[PDB]
Design brief:
Number of domains: 1
Shape: globular
Order of helices and strands: HHHHHHH
Number of helices: 7
Bound molecules: protoporphyrin IX containing FE, fluoride ion
CATH superfamily: Globins
Largest sheet: none
Distance between the termini: 21 Å
CATH topology: Globin-like
Number of strands: 0
């Protein structure tokens, strides 16, 4: 987990992002797909489609909301090693099953701090907090076997 300090920093930068869950959520997905085109292929719903097709998809919202909803929960429990344990476990378990491995999470981690700053300048130490958080997730994935 994250320390109570680091978790607070993450939550602080996330608030402005989550404030507009629908819009920001859809934008995070689009930003990912734009920077890491291979990622789209993992989604049954978006395999083959272009970012334009995806933006116009009536399914986008369902996908980006389920991601932001889950993410919020991760931010909310980040400083609790206990909740993180089960959360990471279940998350990893679900994703590996769909063919997603840590490499796809290394990508998310890469672009995430940039995505948040596009909504509002994070406090100092917030970016390190996120990379740590995503580091926890990448580890879980490798343990799950991907
Ligand atoms: C940034 C963090 C992400 C969060 C918190 C997250 C969250 C989730 C959740 C909560 C589910 C199950 C939702 C449901 O249908 O009830 C799921 C499904 C899945 N996610 Fe992720 N996700 C993350 C990133 C990604 C990435 C990077 C990929 C592909 C690279 C992806 C691929 C999948 C796939 C393929 C499914 C299976 C259902 C489907 O095909 O839509 N996820 N995700
Ligand atoms: F997802």
């Amino acid at each position: 987990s994250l320390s109570a300090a680091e978790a607070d920093l993450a939550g602080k930068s996330w608030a402005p992002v989550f404030a507009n869950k629908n819009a920001n959520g859809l934008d995070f997905l689009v930003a990912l797909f734009e920077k890491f085109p291979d990622s789209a292929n993992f989604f049954a719903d978006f395999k083959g489609k272009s970012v334009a097709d995806i933006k116009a998809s009536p399914k986008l919202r369902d996908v980006s909301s389920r991601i932001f909803t889950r993410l919020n929960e991760f931010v909310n429990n980040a400083a609790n090693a206990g909740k993180m344990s089960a959360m990471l476990s279940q998350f990893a378990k679900e994703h590996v099953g769909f063919g997603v491995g840590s490499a796809q999470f290394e990508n998310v981690r890469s672009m995430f701090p940039g995505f948040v700053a596009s909504v509002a300048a994070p406090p100092a130490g917030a970016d390190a907090a996120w990379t740590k958080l995503f580091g926890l997730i990448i580890d879980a994935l490798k343990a799950a076997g991907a």
